[PDB]
Design an enzyme around this catalytic site. Structure first.
Site, PDB file in Angstrom:
ATOM      1  N   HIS A  36     -21.892  29.841   9.415  1.00 32.47           N
ATOM      2  CA  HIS A  36     -22.143  28.462   8.982  1.00 32.47           C
ATOM      3  C   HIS A  36     -21.027  27.883   8.144  1.00 32.47           C
ATOM      4  O   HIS A  36     -21.290  26.676   7.795  1.00 32.47           O
ATOM      5  CB  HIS A  36     -23.475  28.307   8.247  1.00 32.47           C
ATOM      6  CG  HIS A  36     -23.498  28.895   6.858  1.00 32.47           C
ATOM      7  ND1 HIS A  36     -23.963  30.190   6.525  1.00 32.47           N
ATOM      8  CD2 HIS A  36     -23.096  28.314   5.684  1.00 32.47           C
ATOM      9  CE1 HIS A  36     -23.952  30.384   5.232  1.00 32.47           C
ATOM     10  NE2 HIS A  36     -23.410  29.268   4.729  1.00 32.47           N
ATOM     11  N   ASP A  63     -25.341  34.498  12.014  1.00 30.56           N
ATOM     12  CA  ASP A  63     -24.554  33.769  10.998  1.00 30.56           C
ATOM     13  C   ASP A  63     -23.275  34.557  10.814  1.00 30.56           C
ATOM     14  O   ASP A  63     -23.302  35.358   9.889  1.00 30.56           O
ATOM     15  CB  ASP A  63     -25.389  33.533   9.752  1.00 30.56           C
ATOM     16  CG  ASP A  63     -24.662  32.472   8.869  1.00 30.56           C
ATOM     17  OD1 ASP A  63     -25.289  32.198   7.792  1.00 30.56           O
ATOM     18  OD2 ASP A  63     -23.548  31.987   9.226  1.00 30.56           O
ATOM     19  N   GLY A 141     -21.682  28.325  -2.360  1.00 27.93           N
ATOM     20  CA  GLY A 141     -20.265  28.708  -2.529  1.00 27.93           C
ATOM     21  C   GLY A 141     -20.157  30.220  -2.259  1.00 27.93           C
ATOM     22  O   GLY A 141     -19.031  30.710  -1.889  1.00 27.93           O
ATOM     23  N   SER A 143     -21.615  31.976   0.217  1.00 25.22           N
ATOM     24  CA  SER A 143     -21.675  32.367   1.639  1.00 25.22           C
ATOM     25  C   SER A 143     -20.341  32.892   2.175  1.00 25.22           C
ATOM     26  O   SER A 143     -19.248  32.382   1.864  1.00 25.22           O
ATOM     27  CB  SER A 143     -21.845  31.237   2.649  1.00 25.22           C
ATOM     28  OG  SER A 143     -22.878  30.397   2.271  1.00 25.22           O
ATOM     29  N   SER A 159     -25.272  35.091   3.731  1.00 26.12           N
ATOM     30  CA  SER A 159     -25.763  34.047   4.613  1.00 26.12           C
ATOM     31  C   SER A 159     -26.562  33.011   3.840  1.00 26.12           C
ATOM     32  O   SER A 159     -26.069  31.913   3.958  1.00 26.12           O
ATOM     33  CB  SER A 159     -26.770  34.557   5.725  1.00 26.12           C
ATOM     34  OG  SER A 159     -27.288  33.493   6.537  1.00 26.12           O
TER      35      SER A 159
END
Lengths: 198, 4
Positions: A36, A63, A141, A143, A159
């Site tokens: 993502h 993801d 921030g 991820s 994720s």
């Protein structure tokens, strides 16, 4: 840029994510991150300089993403823990109950334990299945960042989770935290990547 | 949960 798990990178001068792990693909350098964070072809920058672009990703459903880097980058087997480093020694998957830590640009290095495996997150753009759940906190921030055991086994990339209004889940108890990472094993086989280890 |  030196590539280390947990540091910040922007995507097309907009969103921010964290680096998961340095990997190679034949003579190509990359790092795995969250799907993502970008779309294929988005530009990744580390401290205002272009380091590469998204080579492939999957989100939602899964993801995952890998960014291929210019040759000028320096990949290192490490994950940021404040000013210190945890050496990536492999990818043995830990079981439920093992302790684990995660590094990202917004909350730094947080540790906790794995509570569950194969969880489905119903994200707004659609579900993501097969996630492992941990109770280490995290925030916006974070991820794409590294999940790793103190002994060095890389576990997956950040994720999502239950962020409260302060933008993280660090203000509520471990027992009420749900922090989901994407397993790394499948990302390595799906893209034919090798982890940089030390 | 939210992704991120």
């Amino acid at each position: 840029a030196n590539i280390v798990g947990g540091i910040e990178y922007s995507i097309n001068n907009a969103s921010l994510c964290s680096v998961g792990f340095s990997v190679t693909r034949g003579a190509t350098k990359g790092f795995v991150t969250a799907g993502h964070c970008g779309t294929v072809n988005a530009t990744a920058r580390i401290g205002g300089a272009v380091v590469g672009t998204f080579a492939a990703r999957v989100f939602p459903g899964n993801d995952r993403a890998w960014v291929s880097l210019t040759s000028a980058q320096t990949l290192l087997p490490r994950v940021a823990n404040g000013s210190s480093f945890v050496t990536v020694r492999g990818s043995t998957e830990a079981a439920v109950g093992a302790a684990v830590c995660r590094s990202g640009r917004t909350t730094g290095y947080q540790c906790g334990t794995i509570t569950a495996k194969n969880v489905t997150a119903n994200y707004a753009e659609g579900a993501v299945r097969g996630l492992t759940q941990g109770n280490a906190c995290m925030g916006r921030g974070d991820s794409g960042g590294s999940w790793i055991t103190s002994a060095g086994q890389a576990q997956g990339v950040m994720s999502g989770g239950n962020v409260q209004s302060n933008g993280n889940n660090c203000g509520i108890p471990a027992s009420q935290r749900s922090s989901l990472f994407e397993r790394l094993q499948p990302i390595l086989s799906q893209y034919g990547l090798s982890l940089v280890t030390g | 949960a939210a992704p991120f």
